[PDB]
Each structure stands twice: as structure tokens, then as C-alpha cells.
Design a binder for this molecule. Structure first.
Ligand SMILES: *[C@@H]1O[C@H](CO)[C@@H](O)[C@H](O)[C@H]1NC(C)=O
Ligand SMILES: *[C@@H]1O[C@H](CO)[C@@H](O)[C@H](O)[C@H]1NC(C)=O
Ligand SMILES: *[C@@H]1O[C@H](CO)[C@@H](O)[C@H](O)[C@H]1NC(C)=O
Ligand SMILES: *[C@@H]1O[C@H](CO)[C@@H](O)[C@H](O)[C@H]1NC(C)=O
Ligand SMILES: *[C@@H]1O[C@H](CO)[C@@H](O)[C@H](O)[C@H]1NC(C)=O
Lengths: 314, 163, 163, 163
């Protein structure tokens, strides 16, 4: 008799420890190339922030009212999503963003801050829906009517819940010293924020700034995380953006930063700016920053795992 | 797959087969046990290998608003080092499992060849091209008995010893 | 270990052994060289593997008072990626060294089998089940002579060629 | 390389060869195909191993002015973990490719050995020391034909069966 094996005319070139580009009868994929350009995440709660931003959900600009306090197992951010209406940055910006990504949604509850004899309805031309207004859960504490002294306020809020609260407040550096005296009065304004693990203090610094969103002054939002049975005292002489509502975490989720539209036609595992990497292969070459339980990134374009034998044509 | 000159093109259903070219006629049959074992081993290797991770990562960087440049460089360097070590591990994986799959196919071929030569004490002998020369005449029942692993070499010895 | 129906349970002292079932009686002995080489190779592989690390790692994260959240997530993600690649490397190494241990056992087994073939020119031949059919009768002396690797075949050739 | 007592020291040009000890005299020759295949495989392994990486790392830590102690210790710990995993991967790769090159040399020796036994059906048999006992007289033409893979065993069977 004659004993032998099977082969095909056209096989696959695979990499091997001895020789590179050896010919096999059949081979399979290990590095995924096909990327789904959609955030297809059926089976889990998702929110599409869109022109809203994830950090804007706390303070509440006009673009971020709809997703002010939400709940999802997947959070999606976009490049067009702005975090602020009145211009200004966030100290520990990425730390707060990563806290919000694992929040599972946020809940706003009032602190019960009562202000006596002082105008509290902030109004800007930039943070506008129909007229001059301000953020959702932030209260810009102006003077009474005009240039006048701002009394020293000591407002204490105690987190009585069983979960660690999140507090965001703001600092107004006016576009000029005259504007600061118009809004809060003369004198060196000094603000302290006191907690068991937080004692950082700061001073507003008026000065000229470029017109961002049609406004000169900038408000920097500081933040902290409160443990249960812990209280925060805001001792502010003036120029304060007080927190009307405290933000509370809900559960466990994961945050992605994509730019493609959302549907529910898959069982997705990891997501990135190009979409969803749905596959079972151990490695992928779509994006280096895909986050979730999915294949790992590799530098190679393609690896063929030899599933069949090494074939030789007849 | 070393001593065999080439692989058969007409062997479609089975990986390892049999050709007899006896006086009865011509026919290319397929062994079942060796190819089933080889496909079972390779599919088990794939099922071990084709496995999505049970550990879920998070977004450490930001695409839109760039993080602080020092911690950004630290994150980029850590991700680049992890990407390079994962790429090296992946190419090493693919190379050594392709080598082991080729060696497994060769070992299954060798095991089938050795079990055929063990079934065929002296009534048949090796050729060097993967073929076997038979010292007896038998009509397609002996061939299937070789294929069915139920060969009775006891009563072929008397006419094949002198040949 | 592929062409054998089953492994012996009464073989205790040696990994690879021998059975006779000759006219003198029944005996189950143990080879020494093949099992010594196999245990030496596998224990050397273990001693290579069983090695505590030399590199010294310090505490980078604080369990009690949590570090800054950005650098905390950076440390957590770096440790998670290192944990995943270490779990990957550990399972890959365990799988391939178990494969190499099984292949080494098979290699020592059929190396002993082929050296028994080499010791017996035509006085014995295989059956396909792992047994050798001796064509000469000895009073348990040539049993040990095969076992002790001191077997002379040329003096047993004249009575085994005609059978 | 298992059944051989010791490798030859007088063989320089190739890797695998032949010794003569015939009636014409004693001579040493070198096989060409098997050593070419072995050197080709090992040099391909070197070529796929000896490769400078494409990934271009950047300077993350400052040697002269020490960086902040927290982020600096994070960089040190990440670099130490990557150094440990690269050292482990280097030991793993070196050990497994040394094992694979040793097994490849053994398998090339085995392939040459089995192809020599396949060339000579009954005209020669093994002795266990790596030699073949020729049962016919031929003055260096048959042996060079063995080396050239052009051996015609059909015209030597008649005088080798009775011996
Ligand atoms: C070849 O491998 C691929 C793996 O992608 C598989 O889908 C296909 O069925 C295989 N073909 C054969 C003939 O085994
Ligand atoms: C928090 O305070 C409440 C009321 O005083 C008490 O019932 C609860 O046990 C406290 N929890 C902790 C962790 O101290
Ligand atoms: C870090 O890597 C990403 C891609 O993974 C890239 O888009 C980004 O620009 C890099 N950051 C820096 C600072 O180079
Ligand atoms: C980092 O991992 C440890 C477990 O090793 C965990 O206890 C800790 O909470 C993690 N840190 C963060 C910020 O999740
Ligand atoms: C980090 O490692 C370098 C050498 O790799 C060393 O010179 C330096 O002192 C280390 N840094 C610290 C903080 O130990």
C-alpha cells in the first residue's frame, strides 16, 4: 500500500520557530482586524452623553442637563462634549473623570444650604438657555445689589449616607478686580474647605483673561470625596460658587470615549474611539487603548495560527 | 511528513489516508482514528487559546483632553512596554504553537506509519516514500482490515516468510 | 505510550519496567536507566522552575490611606496589566512544560523500546501492543541480560532465523 | 544522538556523516542534505530571534535631577516589573529554543537514520551503536550511492536473504 496525508493547492503562510512563512493546509486567525464601527452593547445600560461631557453631569451646564443625574453600566463620551458653560478647568481633572467613569451613574441630593439676605441666583451670558443663568446644581453667590461687602459664611454639610459622597465646588477668578468688587466687594477674599482628610485652602485671583465662550473670568471647580459620617465646612468670605447639590455614586460601570453611534445589536465586551472590538481571539490590532474584557493589543499586523498540517503540493 | 514525497490532493474528508493500488483496483480511502485524534488535539489547543480575558480594564488615559504631560508620558511608556511585551508573547505563541502543530501532525503521521508497520510484521515492508510493499495477494478485505485496525497477520506468515 | 493498551499498576519502584511471561513463570521487573534519566530531566526542569525571585519589589500603593486617585489608577492599571501578563505566562509555561513532560515520558518510553529493538535483531519482534515475541528459550537469564543491557544476539541467531 | 556512544571529532565540514570500515579501508564522509536542513532551520530560528525591535521607547526618568519621589518610584517599580518579566521571558525563550535545537538535531539524526534503514530493506540492520551491518560486498560505489540517495536495493536482495 501507499500511506500519506492530505494537501491543498492554495494553503496559508504561517510563522514558525524554525522557518518564517511556511505553507500549511489550513490556518486560523489570532489577531482581530475587523472592527465594528458602532458601540453595540445590548444587555447593559448605556448613556450617550453626546454634546454633553461626563464631568459636566456634576455641575450641570445647559448641554449636560439631560444627563445631569443618570444611571448606566456603560458611559460614553464624545469629543464635542464640553464640561463647562462658564469657562474654567477642573483640578485633578482625570481623577474626577475616572471616579465618574466607575460611578455607575450619579445621584444629586440637596445639602440644605440656606443663605440669609444675599442674592444667590447666578446669571451669565455664556451659560444660557433662554436668558442669563448659571449651572444646574451650582449657586453663584453674588453681592446683595451692587458693590458691597460679602459676609463671611461658614456652611457645614454632613454626608449621612452609607456610600462615599462627591462634592464639587467652584472658585471665581474674575476678569478684573473691578468686576470682583462688583460681584463680591473689596477685600482679600479667602476660602477654606475643611474635612477629615481634606484641608486645602485657596484664594481667588482676579485678572484679565482671553474671552473664552464670550466670558473673561474663569471658575475652577475643586472637588473631594466624603466618607460616610463625615462633614465638610466651607468657610468663604466671598467669590464662591457654592454646591447646591451633592453628587453620590450609584454602582459599578465603565467609561469609554468613542465617536460612533450607539445601537443594541451585539454582545459587546470592549470599546474605543473606533467602536467595539467584538471577537473571541486572544489578540487584536485595532486600537491600543480598548478598555474592557477583550483581546490584547499587538504590534503585528497579522498572525496565522496553523490549524492544519504542513502541506506539500502534489 | 518527512519521508513522504508529497501530500495527496484527492484526500478530502480525512487528514491521514490510505492508497493501496492493488490488483483489484485503485482507491484512496481515509483513516479515521489518527485524523480524529489530531483534530481533537488541535481544536483543544484552539479552545485553550481562543479565550477572551476574564479581567476587565479601565480607561487610564484621555483621548480628548490630554492628561498632565509627566503622567501622560508614564502612561504612554507603560502602555508601549505592555504592547511590546504582548506583541513578543503573541508572536512567540504563534511560532511555537505552529511548530507544535506541525510536529503534532508529523508525530500522528509517524504513529500511524509505525502502527501500520506493527500490524505488518513481515508480510509487508517499508519503502522510504511512505509506501508499503506486500508479499501476499488479498482482495480488499485485508486492506480494510488494515484500515479497521483488525489485521490478522498470523495466517499470512507462511507465504510471506520466503518472499 | 500511544500504542500501549494500558499502563501497569504493579510497577512501583521504576517508571519503566518489563514483563516476561515465559516458560519459567511470570515476573514484573523495573528498568533503571530510562527512569533515572527521565526523573533527572524532570527534576532538573522543576529545579529550574522552583526558584524564588531575586528582584526586590517595594510597596508602591498604600492599603490604609488611599493615594491620589489618578496615580492610584495608574498603579492599579500597571499592576493589573502585570498580573494579567504574569497569569498568561504562568498558564502558558505550565501548559507547555506539561506537554514537554508528557513528550519526554513518551520519548524515554520509545527510546527504551527502540533500544530493545536494537538489542534484538531478529530473535524478537514487536506485536503492536508494546510486547516483544522472543524466539528463544532461556531460564530467566536472557531476561535480565536484556534488562542489564548486556545482551548478545549473535549466539541466538541460528535458532531464531528459521522460526 | 541517543543510541550513539560518542560523537565523532574528526568530522569538520558537515554536521552528520558516515564511517566506512569496509574491505577497501576506512574512510569518513559527510552527508549534505540533512545538515543543510538542520543549519537552515537553526539559522532561520536565529534570524527570527536576532532582530532589533521596532518599538522606540522614550526617556521616562531623569538620571541627573531626580524626579518627584512618588511618580519616580512608580516609574522605578514599572521598570523593575518589566525587567523581571523580560528576564523571565528571555530565560524561557533561551531554554525552550535550546531544547528545540537539541531536539531538532536529534530529529535530523533520527530522520537520516530512518531514511538509511528505509533505503536498505534487509541488506543492513542496526547494531544499537548507530552503525549498519552490511550483508553484501561493494567497493565504495554502493556506499556513495547510499550517500547520494540513489541506492538500488533490488539488485542486492538475492545474496542478503540467506545471510
Ligand atoms: C480552516 O480553518 C478555518 C478557521 O478560520 C475554519 O473556519 C475552516 O472550517 C477550516 N477548514 C477546514 C477544511 O478544516
Ligand atoms: C454613623 O452615624 C449613625 C448615627 O449617628 C450611626 O448609626 C452609624 O453607626 C454611624 N456609622 C459609622 C460607620 O460610624
Ligand atoms: C499615548 O498613546 C496614544 C495612542 O495609544 C496617543 O494617541 C497619544 O498621543 C500618546 N500620548 C503622548 C503624550 O504621546
Ligand atoms: C487597586 O488594587 C487593590 C488590590 O490589589 C484594591 O484594593 C484597590 O482598591 C485598587 N485601587 C483602586 C483605586 O481601585
Ligand atoms: C530607579 O532606577 C535607577 C536605575 O534603573 C536608579 O538609578 C534610581 O535611583 C532609581 N530610583 C529610585 C527612586 O530608587
Amino acid at each position: 500500500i501507499c500511506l500519506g496525508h492530505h494537501a491543498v493547492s492554495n494553503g496559508t503562510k504561517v510563522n514558525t520557530l524554525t522557518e518564517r512563512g511556511v505553507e500549511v493546509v489550513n490556518a486560523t486567525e489570532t489577531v482581530e482586524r475587523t472592527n465594528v464601527p458602532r458601540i453595540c452593547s445590548k444587555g447593559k445600560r448605556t448613556v450617550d452623553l453626546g454634546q454633553c461631557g461626563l464631568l459636566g453631569t456634576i455641575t450641570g451646564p445647559p448641554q449636560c442637563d439631560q444627563f445631569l443625574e443618570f444611571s448606566a453600566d456603560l458611559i460614553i463620551e464624545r469629543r464635542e462634549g464640553s464640561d463647562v458653560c462658564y469657562p474654567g478647568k477642573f483640578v485633578n481633572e482625570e481623577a474626577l473623570r475616572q471616579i465618574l467613569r466607575e460611578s455607575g451613574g450619579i445621584d444629586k441630593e440637596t445639602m440644605g444650604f440656606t443663605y440669609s439676605g444675599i442674592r444667590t441666583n447666578g446669571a451669565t451670558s455664556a451659560c444660557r438657555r433662554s436668558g442669563s443663568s448659571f449651572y444646574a446644581e451650582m449657586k453663584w453667590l453674588l453681592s446683595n445689589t451692587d458693590n458691597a461687602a460679602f459676609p463671611q459664611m461658614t456652611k457645614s454639610y454632613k454626608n449621612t449616607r452609607r456610600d462615599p459622597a462627591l462634592i464639587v465646588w467652584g472658585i471665581h477668578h474674575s476678569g478684573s478686580t473691578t468686576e470682583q468688587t462688583k460681584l463680591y466687594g473689596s477685600g482679600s477674599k479667602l476660602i477654606t474647605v475643611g474635612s477629615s482628610n481634606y484641608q486645602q485652602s485657596f484664594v481667588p485671583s482676579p485678572g484679565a483673561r482671553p474671552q473664552v465662550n464670550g466670558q473673561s473670568g474663569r471658575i475652577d471647580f475643586h472637588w473631594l470625596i466624603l466618607n460616610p459620617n463625615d462633614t465638610v465646612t466651607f468657610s468663604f468670605n466671598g467669590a464662591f460658587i457654592a454646591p447646591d447639590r451633592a453628587s453620590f455614586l450609584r454602582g459599578k460601570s465603565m467609561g469609554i470615549q468613542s465617536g460612533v453611534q450607539v445601537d443594541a445589536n451585539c454582545e459587546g465586551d470592549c470599546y474605543h474611539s473606533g467602536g467595539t472590538i467584538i471577537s473571541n481571539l486572544p489578540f487584536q490590532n485595532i486600537n491600543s487603548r480598548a478598555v474592557g474584557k477583550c483581546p490584547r493589543y499587538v504590534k503585528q499586523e497579522s498572525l496565522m495560527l496553523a490549524t492544519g498540517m504542513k502541506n506539500v503540493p502534489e | 511528513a518527512g519521508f513522504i514525497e508529497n501530500g495527496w490532493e484527492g484526500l478530502i474528508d480525512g487528514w491521514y489516508g490510505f492508497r493501496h493500488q492493488n490488483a483489484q483496483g485503485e482507491g484512496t480511502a481515509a483513516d479515521y482514528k489518527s485524523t480524529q485524534s489530531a483534530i481533537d488535539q488541535i481544536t483543544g489547543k484552539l479552545n485553550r487559546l481562543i479565550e477572551k480575558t476574564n479581567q476587565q480594564f479601565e480607561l487610564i488615559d484621555n483621548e480628548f483632553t490630554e492628561v498632565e504631560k509627566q503622567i501622560g508620558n508614564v502612561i504612554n511608556w507603560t502602555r508601549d512596554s505592555m504592547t511590546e511585551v504582548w506583541s513578543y508573547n503573541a508572536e512567540l505563541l504563534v511560532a511555537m504553537e505552529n511548530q507544535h502543530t506541525i510536529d503534532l501532525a508529523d508525530s500522528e503521521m509517524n504513529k500511524l506509519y509505525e502502527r501500520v508497520r506493527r500490524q505488518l510484521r513481515e508480510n509487508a515492508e517499508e519503502d522510504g516514500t511512505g509506501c508499503f510493499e506486500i508479499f501476499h495477494k488479498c482482495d480488499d478485505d485485508c486492506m480494510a482490515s488494515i484500515r479497521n485496525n483488525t489485521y490478522d497477520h498470523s495466517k499470512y506468515r507462511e507465504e510471506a516468510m520466503q518472499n
